Amino acid sequence: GSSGSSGGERRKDRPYVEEPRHVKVQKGSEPLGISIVSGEKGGIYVSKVTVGSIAHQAGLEYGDQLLEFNGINLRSATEQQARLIIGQQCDTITILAQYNPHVHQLSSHSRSGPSSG
């Protein structure tokens, strides 16, 4: 037979990287309001976080690599999906972030105005 179970083992080993955390979000029939970007051979990364929006309230910031969204796997989730997964409809949703001291970049937007639409 079989059912399922999990377990770990805490040892005196370096943390390597700031362990993952679970940030709760109190949407309440509202959007998150955050930008995400996909990496060549990586995962999803916060590109921005509207201030005053759910996210903000939750306390989300840029660089915070989204590991899992309410369970979903962002590691595989694409920018188009992440932009949706996060833009879902859930009164209360959680996020599994994990600050990574290896994402210090910056870039400027493209030159354009109110075009295309």
Swiss-Prot record:
Which disease is the protein involved in?
A: Yuksel-Vogel-Bauer syndrome: An autosomal recessive disorder characterized by multisystemic manifestations including cystic kidneys, nephrotic syndrome, hydrocephalus, limb abnormalities, congenital heart disease and craniofacial malformations.
Domain PDZ: residue ranges: 22-101
Domain characteristics, as noted in the entry: The guanylate kinase-like domain interacts with the SH3 domain.
What is the protein's quaternary organization? Interacts with MPP1. Interacts with CTNNB1 and with the third SH3 domain of SORBS3 to form a ternary complex. Interacts (via coiled-coil domain) with MARK3. Interacts (via PDZ domain 3) with STK3/MST2 and STK4/MST1. Interacts with SCRIB. Interacts with CTNB1, SMO and (via PDZ4 or guanylate kinase-like domain) with KIF7.
The places in or outside the cell where this protein is found are: Cell junction; Cell membrane; Postsynaptic density; Cytoplasm, Cytoskeleton, Cilium basal body
Tell me the organism. Homo sapiens (Human)
Gene (name only): DLG5
**What does the similarity note say?**
Belongs to the MAGUK family.
Tissues expressed in: Highly expressed in normal breast tissues and low-grade breast cancer tissues (at protein level). Highly expressed in the placenta and prostate. Expressed at a lower level in the thyroid, spinal cord, trachea, adrenal gland, skeletal muscle, pancreas, heart, brain, liver and kidney. A short splice product shows more limited expression, being absent from at least the brain.
Q: What is this protein called?
A: Disks large homolog 5
User: What is its biological role?
Assistant: Acts as a regulator of the Hippo signaling pathway. Negatively regulates the Hippo signaling pathway by mediating the interaction of MARK3 with STK3/4, bringing them together to promote MARK3-dependent hyperphosphorylation and inactivation of STK3 kinase activity toward LATS1. Positively regulates the Hippo signaling pathway by mediating the interaction of SCRIB with STK4/MST1 and LATS1 which is important for the activation of the Hippo signaling pathway.
- Please, which domain of life does this record's source organism belong to? Eukaryota
